[PDB]
Amino acid sequence: KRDEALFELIALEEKRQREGLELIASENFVSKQVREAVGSVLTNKYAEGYPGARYYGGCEVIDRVESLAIERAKALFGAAWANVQPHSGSQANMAVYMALMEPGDTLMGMDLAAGGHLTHGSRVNFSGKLYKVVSYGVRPDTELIDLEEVRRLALEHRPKVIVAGASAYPRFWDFKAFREIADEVGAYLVVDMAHFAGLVAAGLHPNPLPYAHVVTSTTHKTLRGPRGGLILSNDPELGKRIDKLIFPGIQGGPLEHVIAGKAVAFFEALQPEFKEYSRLVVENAKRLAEELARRGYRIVTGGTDNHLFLVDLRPKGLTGKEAEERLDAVGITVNKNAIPFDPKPPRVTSGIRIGTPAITTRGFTPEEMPLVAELIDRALLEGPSEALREEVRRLALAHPMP
Amino acid sequence: KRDEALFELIALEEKRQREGLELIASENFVSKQVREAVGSVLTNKYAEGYPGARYYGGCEVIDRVESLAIERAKALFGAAWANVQPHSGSQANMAVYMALMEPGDTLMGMDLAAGGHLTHGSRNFSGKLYKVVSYGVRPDTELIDLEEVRRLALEHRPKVIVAGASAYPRFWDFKAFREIADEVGAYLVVDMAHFAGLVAAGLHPNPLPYAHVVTSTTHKTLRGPRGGLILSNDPELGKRIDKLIFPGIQGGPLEHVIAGKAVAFFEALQPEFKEYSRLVVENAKRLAEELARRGYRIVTGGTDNHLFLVDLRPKGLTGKEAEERLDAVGITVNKNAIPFDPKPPRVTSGIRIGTPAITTRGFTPEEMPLVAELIDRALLEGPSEALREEVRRLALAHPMP
Numbered sequence: 144k145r146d147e148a149l150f151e152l153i154a155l156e157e158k159r160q161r162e163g164l165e166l167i168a169s170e171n172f173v174s175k176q177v178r179e180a181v182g183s184v185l186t187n188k189y190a191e192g193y194p195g196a197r198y199y200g201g202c203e204v205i206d207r208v209e210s211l212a213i214e215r216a217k218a219l220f221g222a223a224w225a226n227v228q229p230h231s232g233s234q235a236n237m238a239v240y241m242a243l244m245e246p247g248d249t250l251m252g253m254d255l256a257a258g259g260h261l262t263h264g265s266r267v268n269f270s271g272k273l274y275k276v277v278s279y280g281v282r283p284d285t286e287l288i289d290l291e292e293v294r295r296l297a298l299e300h301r302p303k304v305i306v307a308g309a310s311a312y313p314r315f316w317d318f319k320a321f322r323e324i325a326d327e328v329g330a331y332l333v334v335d336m337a338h339f340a341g342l343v344a345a346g347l348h349p350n351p352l353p354y355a356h357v358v359t360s361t362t363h364k365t366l367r368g369p370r371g372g373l374i375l376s377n378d379p380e381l382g383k384r385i386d387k388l389i390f391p392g393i394q395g396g397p398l399e400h401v402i403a404g405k406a407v408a409f410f411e412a413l414q415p416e417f418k419e420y421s422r423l424v425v426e427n428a429k430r431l432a433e434e435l436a437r438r439g440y441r442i443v444t445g446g447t448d449n450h451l452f453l454v455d456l457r458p459k460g461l462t463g464k465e466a467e468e469r470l471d472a473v474g475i476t477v478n479k480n481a482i483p484f485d486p487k488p489p490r491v492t493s494g495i496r497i498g499t500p501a502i503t504t505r506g507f508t509p510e511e512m513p514l515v516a517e518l519i520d521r522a523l524l525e526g527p528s529e530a531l532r533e534e535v536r537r538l539a540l541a542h543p544m545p
Numbered sequence: 546k547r548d549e550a551l552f553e554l555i556a557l558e559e560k561r562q563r564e565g566l567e568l569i570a571s572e573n574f575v576s577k578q579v580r581e582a583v584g585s586v587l588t589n590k591y592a593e594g595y596p597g598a599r600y601y602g603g604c605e606v607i608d609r610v611e612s613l614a615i616e617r618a619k620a621l622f623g624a625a626w627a628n629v630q631p632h633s634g635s636q637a638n639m640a641v642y643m644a645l646m647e648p649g650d651t652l653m654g655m656d657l658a659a660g661g662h663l664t665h666g667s668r669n670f671s672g673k674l675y676k677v678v679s680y681g682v683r684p685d686t687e688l689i690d691l692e693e694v695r696r697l698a699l700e701h702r703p704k705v706i707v708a709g710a711s712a713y714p715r716f717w718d719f720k721a722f723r724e725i726a727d728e729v730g731a732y733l734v735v736d737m738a739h740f741a742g743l744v745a746a747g748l749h750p751n752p753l754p755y756a757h758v759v760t761s762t763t764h765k766t767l768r769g770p771r772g773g774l775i776l777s778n779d780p781e782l783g784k785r786i787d788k789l790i791f792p793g794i795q796g797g798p799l800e801h802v803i804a805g806k807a808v809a810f811f812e813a814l815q816p817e818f819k820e821y822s823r824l825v826v827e828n829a830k831r832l833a834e835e836l837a838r839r840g841y842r843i844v845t846g847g848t849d850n851h852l853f854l855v856d857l858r859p860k861g862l863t864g865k866e867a868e869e870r871l872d873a874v875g876i877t878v879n880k881n882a883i884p885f886d887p888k889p890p891r892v893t894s895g896i897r898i899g900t901p902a903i904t905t906r907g908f909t910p911e912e913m914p915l916v917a918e919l920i921d922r923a924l925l926e927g928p929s930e931a932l933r934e935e936v937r938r939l940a941l942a943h944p945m946p
């Protein structure tokens with residue numbers, strides 16, 4: 144028997160994805176071939192270990208698949224070593240921390256409201272429960288990272304690991320400076336490029352490989368690959384320790400169907416079309432931010448250098464939660480998001496985050512941003528209305544889906 | 546532009562799966578509809594949080610998918626709470642350990658050499674964050690000794706005691722384990738990953754009423770997609786573990802895999818699953834008997850579940866040797882230590898064999914004698930082309946899902 148109820152739901156999610164404007168910065172739309180690989184029979188094989196060194200037999204073919212994913216990741220980012228087994232970006236960070244630190248050590252990361260990820264030291268996350276956390280933020284005036292403040296904290300606290308990279312920071316990172324700061328205190332520099340990995344691959348964002356000791360990332364998000372993790376390093380010696388922490392350290396059998404999909408995504412990222420795609424992602428973000436700014440919205444840092452931006456809704460008397468609900472009601476999906484110095488808890492927040500990777504995959508161009516800006520503005524001021532939902536639906540339907 | 550190199554490898558893997566006999570106890574072959582769900586667009590959605598309380602908009606449909614998975618799991622296993630977000634069995638155990646213990650606490654679990662799993666105390670995150678005490682089997686019975694388990698518990702006062710393993714061919718007395726746990730004020734955690742499908746089909750004692758928490762994989766005997774699962778009869782304890790899965794140890798859940806889990810639970814709720822599971826056990830018992838008659842010794846003298854352990858000593862072979870010879874002819878098994886093996890762990894004197902996968906391809910008990918003969922010939926005669934072709938043909942005569 145076919146599970147009709149379940150598949151009817153999947154069809155409903157397909158429709159929702161086609162008929163709305165997905166503006167969540169961490170989402171995107173994977174290609175048909177990525178999905179073909181992820182839905183392959185590769186899930187039927189237990190492949191604990193690494194290529195040429197597995198616990199079970201019958202991995203002769205699987206070894207070529209994983210190896211291909213490894214080599215493509217190295218060539219794409221210019222890394223001497225890679226591990227494509229992490230189940231998620233979260234597991235990638237966990238393995239790295241457990242390999243460089245012992246519980247109780249000091250971890251230095253970006254404050255959450257300022258843009259850091261949960262795995263960068265949040266008290267409700269394993270990162271903040273197992274290690275002592277020292278957080279750095281942004282300046283209250285420009286909302287940018289102040290490198291001297293970072294330096295001062297490092298000298299004072301002497302962390303074992305410093306983490307650069309974020310979930311909601313709209314500007315470039317000076318990796319060279321962060322490494323110098325790390326060297327001054329004998330710390331490891333870990334760069335979590337999850338959000339901007341694709342921009343790095345396309346040459347549109349500084350590359351952390353030469354400066355960080357280790358780089359973690361997701362294969363999904365700007366890289367537009369399957370949902371999973373990835374680790375890179377230019378130090379293969381450090382790479383060997385980390386390999387041991389991924390397995391048998393924190394994971395069991397890897398998801399080889401997903402790793403096959405990672406190989407495909409890397410293949411897609413090496414094609415010239417990916418550079419054009421990535422260039423458009425950025426142009427869309429900047430243009431859309433400018434359009435909202437021209438409508439009276441306050442943009443954190445005043446703009447963006449990447450694929451996302453934050454909107455401080457305080458002057459509008461709206462909480463991020465309220466805005467997310469109103470926009471959602473008319474087919475425009477975003478996420479409530481903390482902004483630097485947010486007086487509200489993460490469940491409410493004082494802003495919303497917007498990103499363009501997903502709509503850019505659907506063919507949206509900078510010239511269409513003024514229209515997307517108008518729709519957002521109306522939904523926040525006039526509230527939801529059936530006529531507004533219908534406008535969004537038609538706009539979205541005028542664009543193909545992979 | 547299609548990634549031809551990658552897809553060429555996928556085709557070879559399909560061919561390899563069709564043309565061999567998979568006897569690794571932890572393997573299985575999922576249905577096409579489970580694969581259809583996993584290969585769906587649900588992978589595009591970020592859905593952190595739980596149904597009705599997410600950190601992103603647009604989750605209306607996803608919530609219905611995850612709630613369906615949750616409810617079906619509760620109905621299948623008879624549980625009051627469930628969490629379907631764990632990426633794997635290892636993440637499931639990790640979250641439970643972190644919800645019940647603090648680093649430094651004592652964890653008691655079955656020894657790796659005796660059948661326990663890496664996440665049950667291996668000097669693995671389990672053995673790095675916590676103080677471990679292991680229990681094994683008796684050399685004379687080849688079975689767990691509840692009195693040794695009780696002594697160890699009283700002596701070491703563990704905070705958590707784990708029941709379940711990856712290579713134990715007999716039933717577990719969950720009630721006895723719970724008495725032991727209560728006596729020292731410990732939590733009883735049962736990891737049923739291996740035999741979850743048998744539990745779902747009512748062919749194995751259900752641990753839900755006795756354990757405080759139950760973890761499992763969604764693959765293996767449950768024949769679902771690769772992922773993890775947590776169950777319990779205590780919703781309060783459940784709320785605590787939900788917090789450890791997220792935002793504790795994971796980020797975004799794999800909703801396409803969750804949809805795949807919902808499908809598997811649907812399959813397991815149909816009467817045909819009970820028929821399939823009955824045959825799994827019948828094939829394991831029959832295959833063990835046939836190998837015994839051919840001069841191999843079965844640890845514990847048989848099995849109560851889907852797997853059994855083969856003592857190769859009577860034929861002067863090591864587990865490493867047998868693994869290679871079988872692998873050379875398309876038969877995959879894995880080496881396993883026997884109780885108090887006279888050989889080191891990298892070598893061993895036995896192998897583990899499981900029937901879930903071949904039962905899924907339609908093998909029946911009347912065919913086990915033939916599978917037994919092929920295994921025996923490969924071990925005695927060694928690999929050859931003629932033997933490889935016999936295996937190939939027999940496999941091709943049994944279609945995949």
Ligand SMILES: Nc1nc2c(c(=O)[nH]1)N(C=O)[C@@H](CNc1ccc(C(=O)N[C@@H](CCC(=O)O)C(=O)O)cc1)CN2
Pocket residue numbers: 255256257258259260261262265267310311478480481488489490491593600792796
């Ligand atoms: N800057 C930033 N933005 C982000 C993330 C992040 O990690 N950092 N996210 C990462 O994916 C998403 C939001 N996820 C989050 C989930 C939980 C909590 C949190 O601290 N929860 C607490 C308290 C909640 C309350 O009551 O206010 C808890 O669960 O106890 C924060 C962010 C999207 N945007």
